[PDB]
Symmetry: D2
């Protein structure tokens, strides 16, 4: 069942959020926010820059001070607040799913059924950890009592992309807040709206002021101020490789802040001759086409064993021809637009490189419509490893299908990339599932499925797809700072 | 390569071991120890009884006192001592493998290559844990500092069987000593010799006196004194269900000591039509016949899908006809004797019940030789679920093979037992491996193998096969006692 | 603030709860439930016996079957249900706090502010663990893939006392249900009412039928049927040592079910000369007098250093003279009645033994009122270690105060008991806090406080105060059963 | 007891170590290695540069390949090899302690009794972890089986300082090798000799070729090649802040390799009026003067409460006047030289700034001797927070002592630094110990001691003292890469 908002969406929250109050930009400047489906301005939002980030950090630092409400409150109460924020997002699900769709070009049914559900479930997951973050007592050599405190780090700068605005906000703030950090969030300039609504709910839920601060604005201004800030203890980021590089450099030059990045992928699937063929086709298809291909985990290289390759290509092409393009709010629409001009241009340029480099165009290969940044769903077969479409993240509805005959060789080809976010293995054989998944240099390997993401699992890249893990037990480690306390005693006993 | 002891085995250690010294029994009585292959007495050993156990417990209690060497020494030094004991067992490997074979009726090549290697590796594993046993710091509600100490329990009584004398000694003392407990060990009356040699090495390695005490003797005397002792904090046991019951009752009536038991099994294998047939035959065969069938994990019910059942039965029978019986010290001998008369009698009685109840005798079915407790390796096909050989632990070289056609039904049949120590699943299908292994009520489930036991894995029973786990990270929990320390403070911070 | 129920309490739930429906007893018999303050019957409740327990176990077994809703649902949804049950208990807090007070003789302000808050917070804590109960992947020797499943155990019988009916219900069902077990709960015959209300909320919250079953009734009938049941996998118990012994024996003789017990204490405090005297007096006082002394953790031996002993005794006596006895529902009443005649008789008998054995009666020492099982708050000074009041759990408002001069000696005296549930240490010295707390053989040691119990901490006894731990990360281990799955692979890699 | 090498030290290992063989530099160039006590050349060593690092990385990559000996061997055997390397270092303790002293200007008794013991114990600690590095099985939403592999990362570049050459080598390679990584180590140009000896023992112990590669050489050449290498997965570093910054930038610009740094400190002690004064004086003294002040953890700001300040200053000054300078190999010598000219110059420049800025010179304040880089042990009192000696890491025998009157204020002053490696708290009060240690932004806080470092504890900086932790359970996380494997199944059960 797919309920809808029964009156038109009214945008209310357009300001910078610091110390639980709404601020105008220091400069006074505002910037437009667009609907990618119509190319029309939805509203203007206060443009945060260095001076606004500086205010947010000061508020975040003050909220983190020893003796403050956020530091002294029970861990269990930090969890209570997170479960309350999840209840409120659940309350405003229709509103939030609609705003997400409209601002982000995101199909409404997915926004409502997947993104909103993921936000709610991830917050509830992170809430449960708050009073289960524990240190150790350690049987050190000598007459000492040694324990560790897994403290919060402090002020965490969190720079967020436009492809999953709300989900990415919750992935960042959920763990950070559960561990007792304070945060300065910079949403994507394309998609600040859902973040600012959530900030209203952070106030309503009763989080102490300055625990969450939200500074909408642009990357080289507000983002760079975060990356280079002398009093931000950690920056976490999801987005491009280029910006990731800029962030680590700025961090290195400023205060050696802790950095975790999640960057692109060129995630491969390996489909063995014994694979459930329909299952492999359907998961690989959704693996590459989900949200107009605008997923870090996009299954953008699909290697299929020769004897089933032509059948795989045939079935995949027929699957890609079934989409209905248009406004992501209209029921029955199954493909929305790309987020903006820059991404639109990149996808089309890469599609053209694929034609020019001699890949076989099975379907699509051009733009669509009189308005909106729509790209036809596009399939290429006979793709080889040195083509631009085999090497570069497209972030569009563009599927690459390749044949292999040698399993040793295709593992090498799958691993022959600076990326490593994820991969997929399709086979019925137990030994092959285990050995192949172990050999792939990828952070998540799916077996006979793809794109299965849940709050209980750590998620992150190998190699230049990033560093560190998010979510799961393991992800919570990177939002703590370990302190060893060692006390001289007269005599220790076991 | 299989080296041998180049001179005859001379038995030296025959006394009770308490406070690192050799004691005569309080009574003055001694008991015979036999070689099951010849039925000849090897030596006499001091017979421990209540009074001797009482001395051992007093020594173990004194060694556990706050301020004592064993309580105050570095955890890392407890580990150092365990690695040294492993070095010494490695030094005396030939001696120990020979003594084990001679006293226990255990094939020498297995005693040397498997049992001795298992002892050495398990001690080294347990050594590594000593200074990695850690408590927690806990973010309790209110203004308090709360930590936990995972302390040793105290004096642990450890009652050991005759089928793996040395391995079972190390499985018991390794974890207990690594966690900082002191122990009172009662070896099987049939097989005290290797334990007393190891006690000599415990002295030589430099363990503080009274940390390990070894009281050879009988079950209703020395064993019952341990189970009912008012100052033994925990009893751990491997052996019969009957004795397990006696131990828990005695424990319940005395001082509510912590009890962990490992008892029989009637461990089932399920062989699917798609299984690698030779692999399944070879592992199921070794699964049931290992050490003359005298293993808790014996694969004593083998369920095979109808379409491959007759082939499975054929191949298994030909495998069982390949043994050479005789003295377990002679190279090329592949089956030694059963441990003693009682076990011999039980096996033969159960073989006769199988014939009388209408099971199909494929091979074997009687005794062998003029001397030693030898039983022919015996295979029964067309076994049904209400036969004695399907329900009762045989502890002999007696293999039961059964057909099934419905997978739902055979899972039910495999689970239809009060036992639950282990099981095996043979299939190439990923989904079947996972779903079947999850559905089996068994402590260890092997997939496309059997009898794979290593120090890194917890091991223990579901249901009446016992309680608690041994070895692995998880096993170490049951040799600690958790103490929560909660300290009032003026103000806590995260 | 202390709100109250604005209309009279109407009792609704009086039946056996099995498969989410209300059953009459098989026999047809019912038993009375009394208010200990008035000695008047509140209502009649269906009397569960063996036949009813047998129905509950069958329902619990069916709900635990592979493929059932409770086994297949997301762990996170098990958690969701527990958070919902906590929301409902919060909704009915006034009702439940009132019923608890009326049935249990429990002061209403404590019932409302402490017990109800503890139930709610503990359920929310246990909810958070559900989808964080994890196994391991293990680098076993040889070419194998080994993982562990921390499965639920199965059907858990849970036998509950009358002193904290609601808190004890939640301590039992919260962890068990979070781990995915099904339960058969037997509330105390004195106090079934709050449990049956909670069962109504279990239905309303939407727990699958047969996941929680509640069989009110008596100990030697319904309780013994649980302890001796051939298809209950684990029994957990809080209550007397005598019954604990009966449970382990019955368990041993039947199906070797896993048993965890929490039994009495004779918990000591050690007050050093440098202690904050008022702090130590106030915590030791509340430590022994809380809930009419009817707490397992009662601080029933208080050892005070000679130089501050007379001042400690003086201040404690004046503190004990400040109570107002009467109906626990009336605002300003600070001491309610004892639960029943048996406990009343025991307390008074023990008070008389203290007078006869030459302890110094400072205040109290007799009954109070024309109705209700009230005992005057009683203080004894100059108590010595062989008096009955020094050795035996009183479970009444009876405080024992003792002098010491040697710290070595008083640690010995504090440890000289078969009990070991808890202890308290009062000092300003860092080294003394650490060394004394380490040396005490007690499951929880408080430093400069007492009776600080929270859901994040494991809680349980050393020695004859019980086995196993409840709550905290550590407590969740005892509601799982570890299964090792080891899969043969062609080649493993690190 | 302090044994000595009975014949003169002969230097043997002077070459680059790659694939367990000794290589000349590609260039052919060699560089001198000096004894800081005499300023005399000990030998010439092959100078590694980019081309040699490139060879080492290729060897390390080949050793890490799926299917290789190092990837396929049992975890327990990786541990076995580490325990063997520790046995060999123990065998060559005299040799290694002597070489360390001679090359590093390190007192021989400390080199033998502390450094060598630390190497041996840390290797044995890391050995014990190898087969206890475990992933998880995770109860993910939906019908999936999800586990994690904590794999090794891959090729780890490890850049090592000159102050603890051998200890720092073992701190780096022990965890990395235990987790299954391969390494490219660059020792300090000042101190390559002990590393090259250990490489000989790595060969002798039987580590597969290319698992450990050692490239001696200079920082901007060999070091920069490591930091900027496109096929090194992680760089770990201990040294200056400046180089740390260079490493993160180079890493950022090249392949976004994982970086962990340990950098300087300006570690403060807070001494309360109630502190054991002699204990605080002795630990603070050794805290700042250990190894000629050339420790990252140097207690280089000592804040003492006014009422005991003059007594503290008096006792500290008399302690500092007791040293005997000279050759670190001569028995009775208690202070050796600084490592080299650059460090010598910095210390003397900073001493002069302290005089010029108006700090009170109590003793020392100049160079010593005709040869060697000796600095007199120097104490400054009345130091204020804006002096260079209060702000900058000296890395010399220069002690700063300061008064405070307000505890709130001195915590602020202690935390008022971009550093944060460690701190010390001296008090008898339980509450003050806990609250102060919690409030200090430092990675290790010692209470009533200082400089207590053991293998069981994580160690690392807050703020610009670095990122990540070394040693302890927690440190092992940063030498793994987590892979989530999620497998579609037909139906999951709990
Ligand atoms: N640990 C605690 O918190 C606690 C709680 C209650 C009582 N006690 C101690 O026990 C003493 C006696 O009190 P009690 O008699 O009410 O406690 P009890 O142990 O008899 O009763 C507690 C629970 O055990 C059940 N029970 C009784 N007999 C049983 C049997 N044969 N088999 C199975 N279950 C049975 C009861 O019905 C109740 O549900 C008290 O004076 C006190 O010292 C301790
Ligand atoms: C209400 C308390 S429990 C509790 N609180 C107590 C006791 C004495 N004083 N106080 C304040 C006591 O014995 N108990 C107790 C302990 C074990 C078993 C039964 C009762 C609580 C809080 C938080 C979480 C879950 N429980
Ligand atoms: Cl486990
Ligand atoms: Cl714990």
């Amino acid at each position: 069942d797919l309920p809808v908002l029964l009156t038109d969406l009214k945008i209310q929250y357009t300001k910078i959020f610091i110390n639980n109050e709404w601020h105008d930009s220091v400069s006074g400047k505002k910037f437009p926010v667009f609907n990618p489906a119509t190319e029309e301005e939805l509203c203007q939002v206060e443009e945060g820059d260095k001076e606004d980030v500086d205010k947010a950090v000061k508020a975040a630092r003050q909220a983190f001070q020893i003796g403050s409400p956020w530091r002294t409150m029970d861990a269990s109460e930090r969890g209570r607040l997170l479960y309350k924020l999840a209840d409120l997002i659940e309350r405003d699900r229709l509103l939030l799913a609609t705003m997400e769709s409209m601002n982000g070009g995101k199909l409404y049914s997915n926004a409502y059924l997947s993104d909103l559900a993921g936000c709610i479930k991830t917050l509830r997951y992170c809430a449960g950890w708050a009073d289960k973050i524990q240190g150790r007592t350690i049987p050190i050599d000598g007459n000492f009592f040694t324990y560790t405190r897994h403290e919060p780090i402090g002020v965490c700068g969190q720079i967020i992309p436009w492809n999953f605005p709300l989900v990415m906000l919750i992935w960042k703030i959920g763990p950070a807040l559960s561990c007792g950090n304070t945060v300065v969030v910079k949403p994507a300039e394309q998609t600040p709206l859902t973040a600012l609504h959530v900030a209203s709910l952070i106030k309503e839920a009763g989080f102490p002021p300055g625990v969450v601060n939200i500074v909408p604005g642009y990357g080289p201004t507000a983002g760079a101020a975060i990356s280079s800030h002398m009093d931000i203890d950690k920056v976490a980021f999801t987005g491009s490789t280029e910006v990731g590089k800029l962030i680590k450099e700025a961090a290195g030059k400023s205060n050696l802040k802790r950095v975790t990045l999640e960057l692109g992928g060129k995630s491969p699937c390996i489909v063995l001759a014994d694979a459930d063929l329909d299952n492999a086709v359907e998961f690989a298809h959704h693996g590459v086409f989900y949200h107009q291909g605008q997923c870090c985990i996009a299954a953008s290289r699909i290697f299929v064993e020769e004897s089933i390759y032509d059948e795989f290509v045939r079935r995949s092409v027929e699957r890609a021809k079934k989409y209905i393009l248009g406004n992501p709010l209209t029921p029955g629409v199954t493909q929305g637009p790309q987020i903006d001009k820059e991404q639109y241009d990149k996808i089309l340029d890469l599609i053209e490189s694929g034609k020019k480099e001699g890949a076989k165009l099975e379907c699509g290969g051009g733009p669509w419509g009189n308005k909106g940044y729509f790209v036809q769903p596009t399939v290429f077969s006979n793709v080889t490893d040195e083509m631009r479409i085999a090497k570069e993240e497209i972030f569009g509805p563009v599927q690459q299908i390749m044949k292999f005959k040698s399993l040793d060789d295709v593992i090498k080809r799958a691993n022959n990339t600076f990326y490593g976010l994820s991969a997929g293995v399709f086979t019925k054989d137990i030994d092959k599932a285990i050995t192949i998944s172990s050999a792939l240099q990828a952070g998540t390997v799916w077996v006979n499925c793809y794109g299965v993401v849940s709050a209980q699992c750590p998620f992150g890249g190998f190699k230049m797809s990033g560093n560190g893990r998010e979510l799961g037990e393991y992800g919570f480690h990177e939002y703590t700072e370990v302190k060893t306390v060692t006390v001289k005693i007269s005599q220790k006993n076991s």
